[PDB]
């Protein structure tokens, strides 16, 4: 019973970060072997457990968030960390066990005339909690007045696009990034190495 | 890399009309707000108009009933149509976001002679 | 409408020493539920696009070298430049974006002290 990260790792489609994908992983054996030896990923900094040691390990379940931020945005998904993607599309807690695993994706992801398909909110009256996902698009009330729903001075939309190019920096390139979650609970262990 | 790139203008005799292009890229307009602004030779900024994400848009009395504000989505470009141009708009015209603080970015500028 | 007025209108400095510029607007730009000032200074070189310098009257855009600073609140506000550089000769303005119409200062010329 493999554990289907390849359902994670391989999708054809990636979600805006503002709205990441979670996928729940439980009553399987795991293989991370096949991730860490790997050469493709760019990032793959752990958290809580040493990666090279990952399948000595058992967890209660395993969760796989996934999404598209841009090269300069990487190290935000750690915690701790501060700036617009953290803070407003995907905050990880200061006591998190897991791993963040990201690969650039500029083929996959990149469009001639731009790519505009992939979203990051950039305004929100408060910072998102750990492992929060906001989906709303309400107009933002930046100024004096308020908005009512509609756009006017100082009334944003929340979410802005990233624009990808091929011939991009490869900072303002697309980049796919998997973190997986290690939950241990008081209850039996469902997710171990082989 | 929000950019912005100008193109149109030149030269127009009063009463003419020109059409200003403001193409973006890294960001994308109908999402964001965008301001025009001109700078008359020698002089000062002066603030033309501001186009929210739904395309509508508020102008400066200066320029009210005579300039409109037009867009492209799917070429990510803003229009400028100018529209009885007298010797006074007479300047360089600049096409920059309206970030939440301030104009962050901006395009190259575009000049615009109005002369007979 | 938000009158914007700079002054001295031109200011000579010395190369090396600290420049102050001064921005008033007619009526405040302190919101006062988030306590920010809705106020930006922009630097402009001949033949191109004014440059974003402070905005919230004291928060530096990024890359901007740590010689320029922002302070003042409400309808007083000042730009100063620690320790004047041959580049930064150029004309700054100072804008309100608290209400509409946007409106800017008359600018304020740097130059060189001989």
């Known amino acids: 019973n493999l554990c289907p990260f390849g359902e994670v790792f391989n999708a054809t489609r990636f979600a805006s970060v503002y709205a990441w994908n979670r996928k729940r992983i439980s009553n399987c054996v795991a293989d991370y072997s096949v991730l860490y030896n790997s050469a493709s990923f760019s990032t793959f900094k752990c958290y809580g457990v040493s990666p090279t040691k990952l399948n000595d390990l058992c967890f209660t379940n395993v969760y796989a968030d996934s999404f598209v931020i841009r090269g300069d945005e990487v190290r935000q998904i750690a915690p701790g960390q501060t700036g617009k993607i953290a803070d407003y599309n995907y905050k990880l807690p200061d006591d998190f066990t897991g791993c963040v695993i990201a690969w650039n994706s500029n083929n996959l992801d990149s469009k001639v005339g731009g790519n505009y398909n992939y979203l990051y909110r950039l305004f929100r009256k408060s910072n998102l909690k750990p492992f929060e996902r906001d989906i709303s698009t309400e107009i933002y009330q930046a100024g004096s007045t308020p908005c009512n729903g509609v756009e006017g001075f100082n009334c944003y939309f929340p979410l802005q696009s990233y624009g990808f190019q091929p011939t991009n920096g490869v900072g303002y390139q697309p980049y796919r990034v998997v973190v997986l979650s290690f939950e241990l609970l008081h209850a039996p262990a469902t997710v171990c190495g082989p | 890399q929000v950019q912005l790139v100008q193109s149109g203008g030149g030269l127009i005799q009063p009463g003419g009309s020109l059409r200003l292009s403001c193409a973006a890229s890294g960001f994308t307009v109908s999402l964001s707000h965008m301001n025009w602004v001109r700078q008359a030779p020698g002089k000062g900024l002066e603030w033309v108009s501001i186009?929210?994400?739904?395309?509508?848009?508020d102008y400066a009395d200066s320029v009210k009933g005579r300039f409109t504000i037009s867009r492209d989505n799917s070429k990510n470009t803003l229009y400028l149509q100018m529209n009885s141009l007298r010797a006074e708009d007479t300047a360089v015209y600049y096409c920059?976001?309206?970030?939440?603080?301030?104009?962050?970015?901006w395009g190259q500028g575009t000049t615009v002679t109005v002369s007979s | 409408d938000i009158v914007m007025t700079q002054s001295p209108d031109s200011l000579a400095v010395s190369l090396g020493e600290r420049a102050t510029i001064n921005c008033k607007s007619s009526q405040s730009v302190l919101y006062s539920s988030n306590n920010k000032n809705y106020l930006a200074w922009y630097q402009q070189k001949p033949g191109q696009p004014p440059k974003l310098l402070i905005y919230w009257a004291s928060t530096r855009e990024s890359g901007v070298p740590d010689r320029f600073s922002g302070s003042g609140s409400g309808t007083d506000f000042t730009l100063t430049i620690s320790s004047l550089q041959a580049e930064d000769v150029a004309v700054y303005y100072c804008?309100?974006?608290?209400?509409?119409?946007?409106?800017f200062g008359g600018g304020t010329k740097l130059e060189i002290k001989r």
């Open positions: 186009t929210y994400g739904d395309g509508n848009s």
């Open positions: 804008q309100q974006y608290y209400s509409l119409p946007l409106t």
């Open positions: 920059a976001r309206e970030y939440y603080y301030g104009m962050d970015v």
